[PDB]
Amino acid sequence: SQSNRELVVDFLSYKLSQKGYSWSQMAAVKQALREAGDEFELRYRRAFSDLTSQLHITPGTAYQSFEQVVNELFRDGVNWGRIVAFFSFGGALCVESVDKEMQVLVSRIAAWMATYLNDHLEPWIQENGGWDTFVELY
């Protein structure tokens, strides 16, 4: 019902995006961020794979690794490139966690990310034309 509508909307969003159309503004942001993440990881394939292979992840230290990376990524400011890196980092951190059988971390990571987006990135995004502008720039 709610579940069924969610499935329908996901599929239709995909189909529409394939034809250069969009279900909604949120759907356009989701897809742009997906593609920006791909483009970032492609353009810097070696370096991205290089430092992600240096990730040393354990359940007890996962948050510390997350925070050390993120606070350094945004140490002197925000820009969209850093925002894309933040997502790609969280993605890589989730995969690397599953890569080493630590799946309980994935939902924690999502929450740490959502909180950092809300508390520390949202103020900048809103002063810089919002996610709609990112969709424009991409």
Binding site: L51, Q68, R75, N79
Partner: peptide, 20 residues
């Protein structure tokens, strides 16, 4: 370490920023 992954993410991010 993680700090100095974060710094060498920030080379990559700033010079991705340069299309943004």
């Amino acid at each position: 370490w993680a700090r100095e992954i974060g710094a060498x993410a920030r080379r990559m991010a700033d010079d991705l920023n340069a299309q943004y």
